[PDB]
């Protein structure tokens, strides 16, 4: 079973906000966009400036494999956790996320040479992260929590789409000071603007095959390559061979 998740997003924010106050004669107070009382020395303004732009792209692919007999129900289930580590790296705070998946199936052989299956799929990221800074979100990709149950039949060795989801969105906003926002040379100083775009695609594809012949090369014969190539191999110890001999082969 193949599961694919793709994500893209673009963000920009840019502009200013103004507010302030003036006291005249100590007898008339004037204030501009303040939701609060003022200390009346006056002649006090603030311009809050923001300017940021960002782009993000993420992609995740996962493919479980499970062997079963005809008419026999079978279950596969697997959790996994991932960590990320942050500057100040001596300090004891890893951010982490947990992804988990399970599949329960019941296969049937049709006379037509077709495989019919009853399916449950449950998959996704856990609902309750505790990310406080963005670092965890920019490091580790969110995916939904998704549940499907259905029946499907597929010609032998072909493949099929059981479910999928797509989402697209856009947003725009602008603020301005009614008279100043249109001044010819400085109007742009009195404006605020923001834009958001998002696109998401998620899909589930199934692809069954009949298994007739065992593995070639032998499992052990492959393992022996892996161990040596990795240097994990330690069968050289004169001390361990004394017993490894009983396990490694007849």
């Amino acid at each position: 079973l193949w599961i694919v998740d793709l994500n893209k997003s673009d963000l920009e924010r840019l502009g200013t906000s103004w507010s302030g106050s003036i006291t005249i004669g100590d007898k008339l107070g004037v204030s501009l966009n303040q939701s609060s009382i003022s200390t009346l020395d006056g002649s006090r303004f603030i311009a809050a400036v923001n300017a940021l732009e960002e782009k993000k792209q993420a992609t995740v692919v996962s493919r479980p494999v499970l062997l079963t007999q005809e008419n026999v129900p079978a279950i596969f289930d697997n959790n996994r956790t991932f960590y990320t580590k942050l500057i100040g790296e001596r300090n004891v705070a890893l951010e982490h996320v947990t992804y988990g998946t399970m599949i329960r199936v019941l296969p049937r052989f049709s006379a037509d040479g077709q495989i019919e299956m009853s399916l449950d799929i449950e998959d996704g990221n856990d609902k309750t992260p505790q990310s406080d800074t963005t670092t965890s979100v920019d490091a580790l990709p969110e995916v939904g929590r998704t549940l499907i149950s259905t029946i499907a039949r597929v010609p032998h060795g072909k493949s099929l789409l059981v479910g999928g989801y797509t989402r697209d969105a856009n947003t725009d906003t602008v603020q301005s000071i009614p008279f100043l926002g249109k001044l010819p040379l400085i109007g742009s100083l009195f404006r605020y603007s923001s834009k958001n775009k998002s696109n998401v695609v998620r899909v589930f594809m199934i692809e069954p095959k009949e298994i007739v012949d065992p593995l070639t090369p032998d499992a052990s014969e492959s393992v022996n390559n892996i161990l040596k190539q990795s240097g994990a191999w330690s069968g050289d110890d004169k001390l361990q061979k004394w017993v490894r001999v009983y396990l490694d082969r007849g």
Binding site: D77, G100, T101, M102, E122, T128, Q130, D132, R145
Partner: protein, 79 residues
């Protein structure tokens, strides 16, 4: 795979998803305060956070118990 949750679990989860971030705010506060205990700006903040945490945990527990006893009293009458 995913946890079965009852009803009491839903009640507890309302608090857990109510205080979005307090669970970690408290820890960060402690870390920096412990780094420099003699700063009254750190102290004044940590006092607030710790008090909010205390109230949150207390209310959560007391609530769960009340629902437990309502259910128990209804179930008893089946016999």
């Amino acid at each position: 795979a995913t946890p079965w949750s009852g009803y009491l679990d839903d009640v507890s989860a309302k608090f857990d998803t109510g205080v979005d971030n307090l669970q970690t705010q408290v820890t960060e506060a402690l870390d920096k305060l412990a780094a420099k205990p003699s700063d009254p700006a750190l102290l004044a903040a940590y006092q607030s956070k710790l008090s909010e945490y205390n109230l949150y945990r207390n209310a959560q527990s007391n609530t769960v118990k009340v629902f437990k006893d309502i259910d128990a009293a209804i179930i008893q009458n089946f016999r």
